[PDB]
């Protein structure tokens, strides 16, 4: 039992974008720790990653669990040198119907979790004089959508936090970036109808929904030496749905 | 007169906003966190306003204050969310309390107050929600991750709400001040604020009245086709 | 014959947005020189402005005419202390069908004209330690539209030029800003059908087309002392059609 | 192999781009304005490329070069518009020639070359147009109004063209370098580029290979769902 590869931590790795990111980072040569909210899901991740990764249960809303998970990774696999913040649900509602819990839960799962996990991995990245924090944002952080004020506020806050952290950590060669997916094919889009997914792809310049692997490719690029002079940016992967 | 609610109106930007909105013809309820401050606000606004105590961190107080305003003065049709509290620290030294308090005072308060005033604005088919953001939401500053995240969240929240409320002719906008002359800015002496003003194209720190002018514009009929935007008032410190 | 009011120059003042801007600046207390491309149009402007303005013919594509017009204003009315660059047409075409003239004419009418006129009025603004350059951009400089690559490139170039000039002239208290109209009711939108203008207003958060006076209000604000700490910005007046 | 055309490939950013695209598997035609430079490009690329002389200001030369490439090597399916010529001056001192030459070398050339390669990309239902912009298109620099306007125009042009060509699976993107180590940057000595690198979060000037890496990414299958964007490569000098 000796683990010599650099360690990547991917939260919310069970399916879709998170699963593709985790598998791509494995292919890139990392030892990947993926997280799921349940222990069953964590075991499914352990099974998928085999001897080049591990699955751990983590509710990113809880600081005690964040600290325990990162401590476990450091004590068993090594310092987290790539952090991909992908965990996170939506709780949509127009503001008149958006409850205190609807707001707080989303802000905690997305923005607070990014703050907590980034803070927790900073010591190891600083010691290594190498680090990658890659936050999965969304196109709705830029192109606002009614009913997603909580999600949009959280994602935009994550982007601003990333800029501040990039400035604080730049001299230690830690890059902090966000990837903003557009319409990507997920179980959720699979749930939608043919006609709705044509409505969606009609809004995309490339005239199709993206795939999880497109986001994985963007993250793999940002985590590599090929993006060592890129920090504090948003990398939009939306097929021209939103251009900035 | 139409009722405007301005939080944190005791001094600086908030006070200038309240006085300007009074001049524009609104009945201005300004808030302070202390009852002493609320009484001084009552005294300053006189017959064209009222002062109320409000800790914007507390939902019960928000609901009570808005209910009181509705019961005595009228529907809140202009809401200006003005908070300027900082708890700076580099992330290594930024505690959970430092993060949470800033997020609550700024972003959560914007959520709570905006939600609470929606009914009256919807009924009137008229509304102005004006959120005080900051240049730091765009031009990042080391040690202000919490403040930057909160202000950027406020801007994104404003865009979403603007889409939700637009058809009722309610506009939701943010004003982003740059370096404005204040208590703490006055505390540093000549070379330090020369360091600051050297970054400003207009080569000077702004004044609270500049932000009040932007808020007055957005709250007026002159800006009825402007919604979901950020109005930068920073002398060229940061340029779209 | 003595002219004591501050002089504003509004190019393309014959109708719609330009006409509303010119009339509002008159109401604000300026002596307004408006331009039209023909001498007939210039005479119609002279008639509309009466004793508080003048109409002059100007093809903004031509440097000799720019220099002659500004010299005439300085010699008869006073230094141009407010410049509103509004002259400018569209020549739409998908790139495969966009000719050299289609490109050059639009770039010259919009971007080159802004460069030439701003350069020409800088001396007077510098001497006065007061100045307002206000450029009418467009929402399509931000939300790109197929078939308008020339117009979009010109408007975005104008915005970048404005940022550079704002930095160069800031210490002399000259502000340089752009106003970006969205769907505003013009003869061109009047030409469109009821159903198309509902398609358009359906995209606007405020659920209606704007009016020239909305743009005039934005320009009047920027030209006043109420916006003396605003420079190098874009003021979007699009009813929520585009949010940034 | 697929044919990529890289303008201004003789040195620095352009040379790094050309070499990297060769490594990625493209047949790279690089251009220089002199025939001497074109021959040196031919020598450097050897069996995996060709060097051609091109003054990007001249439409006839653009059409001749692209026709030659089509007649000998194949359809241009990757176009990298790389120009880095400056003619700085504050507006008071910026002549008509200084403005026009920069606009022509940068923006007009992007228009002309992009237009000329559209037919082959459309036929192949594959394409990469990658335009070298600059941080100055976003963070304004006194004395560079012409360069800033041209680069920003290039970015807007790219967005419009991306919408026009997207359904044919042609992506159009810009790469915006920050402070990259070059001839002229090397000319200034330690304290001057320390002044520069102090503005960079990563606390150093970039290298041509960083821009080549970004262009290689965008030109690859790894970026097939990225279009109409600006990829900032500036070490945190300017942050979206």
Numbering used by the authors:
A (entry chain A), C (entry chain A): 1 to 244
B (entry chain B), D (entry chain B): 5 to 244
Provide the publication's sentences verbatim.
In contrast, bacteria utilise the FASII system which involves a series of discrete and functionally specific enzymes that produce fatty acids primarily destined for incorporation into membrane lipids. FabG (3-oxoacyl-ACP or β-ketoacyl-ACP reductase) converts β-ketoacyl-ACP to β-hydroxyacyl-ACP in the presence of NADH or NADPH. FabG enzymes belong to the vast superfamily of SDRs that play a broad number of biological roles in eukaryotes, prokaryotes, and archaea, typically sharing 15–30% sequence identity and ‘fingerprint’ motifs. We provide high quality crystal structures for three enzymes: a functional low molecular weight FabG, a putative FabG protein, AbSDR, and a HMwFabG.
We report the structure and activity of what we suggest is the primary FabG (ABO11256.2), with preference for NADPH. The model showed two protomers in the crystal asymmetric unit with each protomer consisting of 244 residues arranged as an archetypal Rossmann fold. The secondary structure displayed a central β-sheet (β3-β2-β1-β4-β5-β6-β7) skirted by 9 α-helices. An α7 turn α8 motif forms a capping region, or flexible ‘lid’ to the active site cavity. Overall, from generation of crystal symmetry mates, the tertiary structure is a homotetramer arranged as two anti-parallel dimers, consistent with conventional FabG enzymes, and the elution profile on a size exclusion column (≈ 100 kDa, or 4 × 26 kDa protomers). In FabG this triad is well positioned to accept the hydride ion and includes Ser138, Tyr151 located on the loop region between β5 and α7, and Lys155 located on the α5 helix. Whilst an asparagine residue is commonly observed at this site, our FabG shows a His110 residue in this location, however, it is the kink and the helical backbone that is essential rather than the residue sidechain, and this kink is observed in α4 of our structure. For FabG, the presence of a basic residue in the Gly motif (TGASRGIG18) suggested preference for NADPH and categorization into the cP1 subfamily. Interestingly, contrary to previous reports of large conformation changes in FabG upon coenzyme binding (such as that in E. coli), our structure reveals little change at the active site between apo and holo proteins (chain A comparison reveals r.m.s.d = 0.107 Å). Although enzyme assays were conducted in the presence of a substrate mimic, acetoacetyl-CoA, we believe FabG has an ability to bind ACP due to the presence of two conserved ACP-binding residues, Arg129 and Arg172, as these residues have been shown to interact with ACP in other FabG models.
